[model samples]
Target: ARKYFVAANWKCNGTLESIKSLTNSFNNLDFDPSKLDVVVFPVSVHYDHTRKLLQSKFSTGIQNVSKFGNGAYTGEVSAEIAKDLNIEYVIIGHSERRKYFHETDEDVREKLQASLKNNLKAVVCFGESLEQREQNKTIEVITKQVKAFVDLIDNFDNVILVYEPLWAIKTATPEQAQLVHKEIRKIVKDTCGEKQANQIRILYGGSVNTENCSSLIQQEDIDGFLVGNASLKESFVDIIKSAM
Candidate 1:
């Protein structure tokens, strides 16, 4: 059986003081690490602090990593650096990175390869925009994205798949998510074949919160979540608790 995963992506949010309080609160929660694999991706500055606090139970991951192995890339974090800090997971091809930062499928392929090479598990993100969905291009978009990395990572052991529709990231209703979840599961099975498909943990991300977590996790293919905005609050623990 696949273990449930709930990750908090503290995307460009929170202050040092706020992080301290949040970590303290998380440390106090009565959650069983064995049942749920909890992890947090704080801003680079807070990685050490949060890792130290959550290390006893939960794990720590990085939001992004550089495709280039090592160099003066100015504002980029490499997989080597992440591994050195004991970061266990790294997110690749997030919709925001594709939309705003111009990250292409090839870019994601490199990052995925680097993460795997460094012995770090990767949470690879895939999604379609509202326009594509409206035009009935959801499967096409998802197929292209999934195939990009599937072609690169010959082995599937060190990777987790996340399906986060662009609309879902901004305003995903429960009904919409359910339909998309069904589609994603079918696509995963078709693209990766049965063995790799069943073994992979496919998570649902985008607009995931305490109020909607129960419904989302109940979906057949949604093994867990890769939460964004909702992760910075004490309620994040509540979301994890709901999964249990």
Candidate 2:
């Protein structure tokens, strides 16, 4: 059987008070974390607080990890440091990091290797931009991205793949989301091999909300979600319910 995963990418949002409310509400909700692996990625600054508040039933993750394990990286947080803090998962190659931070495929591969070495699970992210889709190169772009890290990782045990196409990330319409999801599954199966592919969970992101989560979750290939904007609210509770 395949594992289901639902992760909230808080992404530079939320205050201590706000996060407290979010965590309290999440704890009060009724769901089996064992059946569905629930995780939260608060901003880096809130890692300690979020970890402390959300450690009981849900796993906590870091949005990014320093490529190098330690030493003179200055402001960067290393995978070793994240492991010490009990962070169970780390997101590598998110669209924002690939876009704004100028991270290359090589850089993402290095981070994945680092996470594995530190005994942390990796939620590796990949997707193409709107213009790439417009050019009808979505599959080509996705293939290239997936091949980069899939080729490097020898084991697939603790790695999860998140397919959050850049265009659909924060504001995709429902039709667009389903279409993107279809394409995402094809890429995963093709790149990861049959055994590794079927064992892996392919999650969708981009404009996922309570209103549309049910339909998305019902899609044949979409095993779960990597929520963004809607994850910050109490509505996130609704999104999880819809998945059930």
Candidate 3:
């Protein structure tokens, strides 16, 4: 059976003391790590420290990595080197990365291949914009994004997929979220084949919270969540507890 994966994509947020305190609180929760896989992605600078400070029950991941292996890229963090560090997972094609940094579909794949080669599990993101939704091209646009992974990812076994509607990131209703999530699952089944598709985990991002998380997880296709802003507060633990 696939485990419930509730990730806190801290994005570009967090302070040294906040991480320390949050991990401390997490450890005290007594959640069975065996039952649910709780992972977090801190900003790159605190990745190692956060991993070390967090309890065994929690795992740490990186927000992004460079396709380049090493050397001359002054600003890039090599995915290969990130693998050597304490990082266990990486989020590729995050909406923020795509919107703010212009990471193309090909770039997402390159980064994904880099992550897998480095032996880190990757959470691949796929989504569509408000304009696309308005034009009734939501699925069409998302397909363009996911099709590359289905084409390149030799094994869907280790990947976790996330579907986040650009316009609904903070306002997606559970039904609306489920609507998109179902499309993602179908696309996986269609592109990767039924046997392989059933084994893959697809998490829902965009507006996931304590109030709506329970309903979202109950969806046949939404295995868990890739939470954003809500992840920063103490109530984020409530989101985790709801998985119970």
Candidate 4:
């Protein structure tokens, strides 16, 4: 079985002091590591400092990694280096990166390949926009996204799947999210094979706070969460606790 993963997508926020407070907050709390895996991704500037600073029970990840392994990439942080630094996970194919930075599934595939080459697990994120869902193309878009990169991988053993419905009826219903997660895992079963589809952790995002997380993680198919704003605050502890 896959570990319950409660991931924090810090995006472009947090400071040195911010991390210090968060770490201190976590230090005062007791976490059940056997029950759930806690992961946090800070802004790139704060990463190395946060990594060296915090001594929490959880793991730290890279917000983004270079597709190119090395040489002539200019400003990119290679996956090899992230692994070398002891970073455990790298978030890829996030909706913000997809919509704002215009990263293609092709790009996501290459970045994932880089992570795999360096033996780092990729937090692979994918979901449909409101219009796509409105057009009833939710399954179609998700299946296509998974299909584009399925052939590039040996297996999905080291990947963390995140489904963030950017639009559609985010009434935050567990059933709605579970149906989508099942669809994604089914896609994995069809393409990457059963072992990966079954073992891979699939997390839900989008307005995932303490109030809704308990209901979300209770779903049989839902593995955990890719928390956003709620992750920045102490309420994240409640969210983490709910993952159990």
lDDT of 1 by residue, 1-244 (tens): 7778898999888777898899988888887787788889888887887787674677888888889777879999889988887788898998888889999999999999888888889999988887888898998898888888875555565687888878544477666776776776677678767776776777888788889999888876778899988898898988988778
* TM-score of predicted structure 4: 0.95
Error of 2 at 139 (Å): 0.8
The candidate maximizing lDDT is: 4
* Residue 242 in candidate 2, Cα distance off native in Å: 2.3
Positional deviation of residue 105's Cα in model 2 after best superposition, in angstroms: 1.2
Better of 2 and 3 by TM-score: 3
lDDT of 2 by residue, 1-244 (tens): 6667888999989899999989988887788877778889999999889878874778889899988978988999999999888788999999888889899999998998888888899998888787887799888888788877776555665888888768644576556666766676666667767776667777886668788888788776777889999889977988888765
Candidates arranged by lDDT, highest first: 4, 3, 1, 2
Please provide, for model 4 over 1-244, each residue's C-alpha lDDT reduced to its tens digit, 9 standing for 90 to 100.
7789998888888878888988677656588766778888988888887777656577899889998997888889999889888889899999888989999999999999889889998888888988898899999999988876767666555788888888842464789999999999899888878887898888997679878888898998899999989888887888888866
Candidate lDDT scores, in order, read 0.82, 0.82, 0.83, 0.85
Q: Which stretches of candidate 4 lie above 4 Å from their native place?
A: none
